[PDB]
Amino acid sequence: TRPTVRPRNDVAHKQLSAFGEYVAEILPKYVQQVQVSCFNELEICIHPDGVIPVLTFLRDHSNAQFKSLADLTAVDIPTRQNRFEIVYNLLSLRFNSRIRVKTYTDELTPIESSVPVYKAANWYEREIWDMFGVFFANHPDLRRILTDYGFEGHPFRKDFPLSGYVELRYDDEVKRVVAEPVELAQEFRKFDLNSPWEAFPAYRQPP
Amino acid sequence: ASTSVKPIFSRDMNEAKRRVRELYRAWYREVPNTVHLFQLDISVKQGRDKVREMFKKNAHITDPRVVDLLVIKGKMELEETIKVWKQRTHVMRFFHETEAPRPKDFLSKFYVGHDP
Amino acid sequence: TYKYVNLREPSMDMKSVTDRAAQTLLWTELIRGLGMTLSYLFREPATINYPFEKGPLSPRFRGEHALRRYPSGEERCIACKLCEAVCPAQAITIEAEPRADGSRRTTRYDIDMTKCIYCGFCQEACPVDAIVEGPNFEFSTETHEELLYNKEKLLNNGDKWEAEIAANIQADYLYR
Amino acid sequence: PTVKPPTARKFIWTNHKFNLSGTPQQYVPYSTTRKKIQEWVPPSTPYK
Amino acid sequence: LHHAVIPHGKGGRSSVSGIVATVFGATGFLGRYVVNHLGRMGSQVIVPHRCEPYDTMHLRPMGDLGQIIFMDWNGRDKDSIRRAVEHSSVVINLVGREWETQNFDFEDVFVKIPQAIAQVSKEAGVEKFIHISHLNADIKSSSKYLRSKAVGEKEVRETFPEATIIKPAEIFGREDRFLNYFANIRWFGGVPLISLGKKTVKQPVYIVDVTKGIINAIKDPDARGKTFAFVGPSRYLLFDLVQYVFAVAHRPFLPYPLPHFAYRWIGRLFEISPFEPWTTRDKVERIHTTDKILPHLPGLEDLGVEATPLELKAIEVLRRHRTYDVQPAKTIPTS
Amino acid sequence: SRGEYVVAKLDDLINWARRSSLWPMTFGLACCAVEMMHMAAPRYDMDRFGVVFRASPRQSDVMIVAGTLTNKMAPALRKVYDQMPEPRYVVSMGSCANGGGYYHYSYSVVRGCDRIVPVDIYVPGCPPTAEALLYGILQLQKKIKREKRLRIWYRR
Amino acid sequence: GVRTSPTGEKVTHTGQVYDDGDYRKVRFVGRQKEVNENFAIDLIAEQPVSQVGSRVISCDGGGGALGHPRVYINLDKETKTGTCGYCGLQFRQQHH
Numbered sequence A: 001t002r003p004t005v006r007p008r009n010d011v012a013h014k015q016l017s018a019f020g021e022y023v024a025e026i027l028p029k030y031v032q033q034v035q036v037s038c039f040n041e042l043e044i045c046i047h048p049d050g051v052i053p054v055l056t057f058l059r060d061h062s063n064a065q066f067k068s069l070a071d072l073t074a075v076d077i078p079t080r081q082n083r084f085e086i087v088y089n090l091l092s093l094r095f096n097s098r099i100r101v102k103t104y105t106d107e108l109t110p111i112e113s114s115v116p117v118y119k120a121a122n123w124y125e126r127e128i129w130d131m132f133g134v135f136f137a138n139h140p141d142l143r144r145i146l147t148d149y150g151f152e153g154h155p156f157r158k159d160f161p162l163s164g165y166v167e168l169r170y171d172d173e174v175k176r177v178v179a180e181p182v183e184l185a186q187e188f189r190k191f192d193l194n195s196p197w198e199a200f201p202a203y204r205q206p207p
Numbered sequence B: 001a002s003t004s005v006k007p008i009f010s011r012d013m014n015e016a017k018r019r020v021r022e023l024y025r026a027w028y029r030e031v032p033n034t035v036h037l038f039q040l041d042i043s044v045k046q047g048r049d050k051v052r053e054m055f056k057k058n059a060h061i062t063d064p065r066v067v068d069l070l071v072i073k074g075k076m077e078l079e080e081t082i083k084v085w086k087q088r089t090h091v092m093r094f095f096h097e098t099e100a101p102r103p104k105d106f107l108s109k110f111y112v113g114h115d116p
Numbered sequence C: 001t002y003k004y005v006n007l008r009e010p011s012m013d014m015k016s017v018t019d020r021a022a023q024t025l026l027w028t029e030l031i032r033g034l035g036m037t038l039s040y041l042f043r044e045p046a047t048i049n050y051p052f053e054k055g056p057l058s059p060r061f062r063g064e065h066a067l068r069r070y071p072s073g074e075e076r077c078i079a080c081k082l083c084e085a086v087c088p089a090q091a092i093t094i095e096a097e098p099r100a101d102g103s104r105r106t107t108r109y110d111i112d113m114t115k116c117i118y119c120g121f122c123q124e125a126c127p128v129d130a131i132v133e134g135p136n137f138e139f140s141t142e143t144h145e146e147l148l149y150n151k152e153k154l155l156n157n158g159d160k161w162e163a164e165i166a167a168n169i170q171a172d173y174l175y176r
Numbered sequence D: 001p002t003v004k005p006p007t008a009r010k011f012i013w014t015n016h017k018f019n020l021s022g023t024p025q026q027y028v029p030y031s032t033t034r035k036k037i038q039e040w041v042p043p044s045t046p047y048k
Numbered sequence E: 001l002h003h004a005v006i007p008h009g010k011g012g013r014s015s016v017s018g019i020v021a022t023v024f025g026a027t028g029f030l031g032r033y034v035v036n037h038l039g040r041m042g043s044q045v046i047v048p049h050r051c052e053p054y055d056t057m058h059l060r061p062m063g064d065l066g067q068i069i070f071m072d073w074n075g076r077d078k079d080s081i082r083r084a085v086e087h088s089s090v091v092i093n094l095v096g097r098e099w100e101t102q103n104f105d106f107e108d109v110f111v112k113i114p115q116a117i118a119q120v121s122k123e124a125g126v127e128k129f130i131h132i133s134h135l136n137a138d139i140k141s142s143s144k145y146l147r148s149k150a151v152g153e154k155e156v157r158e159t160f161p162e163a164t165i166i167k168p169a170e171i172f173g174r175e176d177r178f179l180n181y182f183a184n185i186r187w188f189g190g191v192p193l194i195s196l197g198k199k200t201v202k203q204p205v206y207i208v209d210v211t212k213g214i215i216n217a218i219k220d221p222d223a224r225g226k227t228f229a230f231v232g233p234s235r236y237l238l239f240d241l242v243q244y245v246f247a248v249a250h251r252p253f254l255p256y257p258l259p260h261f262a263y264r265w266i267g268r269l270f271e272i273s274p275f276e277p278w279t280t281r282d283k284v285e286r287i288h289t290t291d292k293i294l295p296h297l298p299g300l301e302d303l304g305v306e307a308t309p310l311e312l313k314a315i316e317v318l319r320r321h322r323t324y325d326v327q328p329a330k331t332i333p334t335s
Numbered sequence F: 001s002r003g004e005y006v007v008a009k010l011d012d013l014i015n016w017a018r019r020s021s022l023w024p025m026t027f028g029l030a031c032c033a034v035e036m037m038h039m040a041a042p043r044y045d046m047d048r049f050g051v052v053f054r055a056s057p058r059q060s061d062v063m064i065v066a067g068t069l070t071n072k073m074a075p076a077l078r079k080v081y082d083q084m085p086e087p088r089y090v091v092s093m094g095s096c097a098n099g100g101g102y103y104h105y106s107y108s109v110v111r112g113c114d115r116i117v118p119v120d121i122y123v124p125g126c127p128p129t130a131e132a133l134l135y136g137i138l139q140l141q142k143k144i145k146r147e148k149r150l151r152i153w154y155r156r
Numbered sequence G: 001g002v003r004t005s006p007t008g009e010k011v012t013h014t015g016q017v018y019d020d021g022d023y024r025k026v027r028f029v030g031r032q033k034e035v036n037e038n039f040a041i042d043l044i045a046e047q048p049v050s051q052v053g054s055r056v057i058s059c060d061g062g063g064g065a066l067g068h069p070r071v072y073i074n075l076d077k078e079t080k081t082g083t084c085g086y087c088g089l090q091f092r093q094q095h096h
């Protein structure tokens, strides 16, 4: 074998492709795309209306049994009509496999809360709200979790500046900690690192 | 179909305004308790005028979905004050007591710097 | 493979049951714990007599950044700015221009020792062994401004610790 | 050092100095670069 | 001049305001607010201090890195004064004391020391000089505090003609000795007052207003060689003013009269304390002296500062004195 | 005997008592708190200098800020500092507390604890070794040894 | 080497010195200005020019892996010497 190249596992690539088709045949109403990566991970892309149907099927079906929610997060892409891509990472102790379920939304369209399916989603959805501003409908307790009280904006959005808009300080006159517009003694320096030469022709896009 | 979207709480501006007013009543009746629990140095009248100013800024919204979010944030900001999750510093950040006034006219901006 | 940690069935014979009655009434396993602390009372403590004794370190230790010279006295740095590019904290600032004799040399070399994460990437990126982290770890100050090093402070450190810096690099450069 | 003395270089400090914080010998930071923009100097002779 | 210091930025903590100021007596009540306002805009502040460095620690967070610089100085040493002022563009004098010590008397701190600073500032080339006199300064006053103020107010006006002399009334604030003075009398049962507090009228001013006035006098070119009178917006009787304080503090109020000579007798008793005396014969004079009216001098409004009522910010100062709405005291209309 | 001689020796007695019984209140916020625990561990044993392991805020003489100070945490820090009985000193431990360190350019981090409270000693490193924090503590002891409170009161 | 300005403040090897009327000098009152006394431009000028008998010579700074990247220098011009771009040492061809 090649000492420096990661080996391929064609067996697990064939098994995850069979199961991806299996899922898309059972939920045509919701599944829009199923893809398997070159390092054997399975992605089910769904319409946002199927968050509860699709997840419930994967948790409870006898051939899926994805009983553990590994993680739930969001990704921000400003160039899409629906900026926010919601990602569910799931685990199956019965079949020793993982699967990724993805949907989408925007600043104003809500998504159904997953707490009924996974009690683990309670805090993850608050974090997506706090950091991205995606509203989850029917959440038992939705509010900021990580940012400071009274914080304005959603810091993980691609257009929110790195250093924010305000900074804290102690003022002796008013005997408390105050908030003021941010001025930096040394401005963060921006490096343009990307090389002007194509790195990977396998991922080239049509012109 | 492009303009057909899912609502948050209100299906039209008329229902949205109902939520705006209920929120305003909640804030109006809390200022006396807030000015007392946090031992603020402002008066109740100053507190109730700040609430009025905050509502006035977003008075030109005509999107029911946007208004729903503003109410959702308002209810979140309200729950923090009632339960004393905020502190005196957080409440007083609405007033900007330690920031010098910044001029609004062209000549004054010309003398100090380059910003428009 | 797996093992159970707490899946034992206690015996219910009279002798075993009486053994646990003596343990409950006469506090046997509590006095077994007093004995262990008694043993440590007679063991030699592990304390060292700082500042007259010091904790052991190794030639790879990462302490106070410093700027080195060639054996002729010429500065090693040639203002390549690789260290400034790799520093994950952006703690380094550099400015350069041709020197009076035409050499490529810096006119500014600052390290903010309060942004710095003391990671060692600056000395891995350097192609000429100019910026190093020395073995000094006792340089606490009384004001914030004394920790903003400029090129003069960094060159003074290099001249001050060259005897020890060179010996450490001699001891480890075969692993790099 | 007695058994294995260090290499000798003419630029190495001969007199070691301990920590100098809080004394008149403390280090004070400053910019090592010169002025960037030169300002125009008005003429010293009246024009009329 | 080749050029000024060319202010840059947005007026924040890391900006450059072009103000290099030396503040004498910056470790007291008034200097704690002047240094904060100078550092809040990005000014270079040199703070010559006589006390232990531990006692200047509250000033360090008031400026960015390297904007607050501390030096040692001696009141009678001219060389120490020179080191602190030869790099500055404005010098502010806040040196003062409400009692005479073993080594310094009212003459030393209000005449000789202000004269030394003014003379050395002139010889060093400082441009703006700001001296802090008193509103009730008068060489014909029963208080030696107020007599020395007048003498110093003149020798400064002669040594540095282009000085901006600020004459405030009694200042009130969190760390004041004016409202905090009419709240610790409770420790002695009743509230003594001369003539039951009648016949005395006071015009106290807010600390922040006096501080904002000082800053605007530095930046205003029309304040060189001019004298101001920073006074509050209302005039009160010494009785109802003290009555108001005890109402806000929510403490029992027993105002009983005491003759002038008796008050001095108890005044001398406290002066024996080798620490900060609770009260002194001199302090009693100024507390029972009526605040003057000088309409011919510019006031706060001429510097753009709007005077702050004592009612809006009395609670801020007296909140601490409360154990475990108050009706405002009456005022004296201007005829 | 002279007054300047009694005050000089009284200053040495109060300084000796204060620097020999520093009771710290440790604000363990982040990784720097781990190195602070190794200073209390048997290898270095801060307690043998008189520096007790843990002290309550009202029984403490020094505050050690060990970790990243966030904007959601700053008001709590100032409150604890204002309630410390005097004399009180603050030791800033690590790059995060000194100037923000790795998170300097973050929106939720206070760039240095010295803009919230006054600071007496800065201990650099990320984290400082347990022998580097100990060196800083012994440097605060010498600073307290140079105090002249009584010798300045006598000259007022 | 270090030479002092008319006001008594030393000049660094980069040429930095505060003018007489610059307020920034106040940071040095009761303190000192850190200046390194070993000017590298003077130190490398004392090194002798090394005579070699080839058109092209190589420099690695000395110490092998402890020096600088190895570069080859051309000595075809007799008007000037060959200078190393890294360490500043000079080389010359022997009469040809």
Ligand SMILES: NC(=O)C1=CN([C@@H]2O[C@H](COP(=O)(O)OP(=O)(O)OC[C@H]3O[C@@H](n4cnc5c(N)ncnc54)[C@H](OP(=O)(O)O)[C@@H]3O)[C@@H](O)[C@H]2O)C=CC1
Binding pocket: E024, E025, E026, E027, E028, E029, E030, E031, E049, E050, E051, E074, E075, E093, E094, E095, E096, E097, E098, E104, E109, E132, E133, E134, E135, E168, E169, E170, E171, E172, E177, E178
């Ligand atoms: N406070 C008020 O109500 C009024 C103030 N003023 C005047 O304003 C000025 C500020 O006073 P204020 O801050 O309010 O009260 P403070 O007494 O608290 O301030 C006095 C300052 O002057 C210093 N000082 C006193 N004597 C000397 C000396 N020999 N040498 C050096 N410094 C000395 C003190 O330094 P240190 O603490 O180290 O001893 C202190 O910093 C005074 O001149 C006062 O006359 C006038 C009208 C109202």
Ligand code: SF4
Binding pocket: C065, C086, C087, C088, C089, C090, C091, C092, C111, C115, C116, C117, C118, C119, C120, C121, C122, C123, C133
């Ligand atoms: S040790 Fe790391 S963070 Fe510190 S200066 Fe070097 S590269 Fe930058």
Ligand code: SF4
Binding pocket: C076, C077, C078, C079, C080, C081, C082, C083, C084, C094, C122, C125, C126, C127, C128, C129, C130, C131
């Ligand atoms: S990597 Fe080395 S040679 Fe390059 S700029 Fe940094 S210190 Fe100088």
Ligand code: SF4
Binding pocket: F030, F031, F032, F066, F067, F068, F093, F094, F095, F096, F097, F101, F102, F125, F126, F127, F128
């Ligand atoms: S300074 Fe370093 S070790 Fe300390 S809290 Fe920050 S990142 Fe962690």
Ligand SMILES: [Zn+2]
Binding pocket: G059, G060, G061, G068, G084, G085, G086, G087, G088, G089
């Ligand atoms: Zn070379």
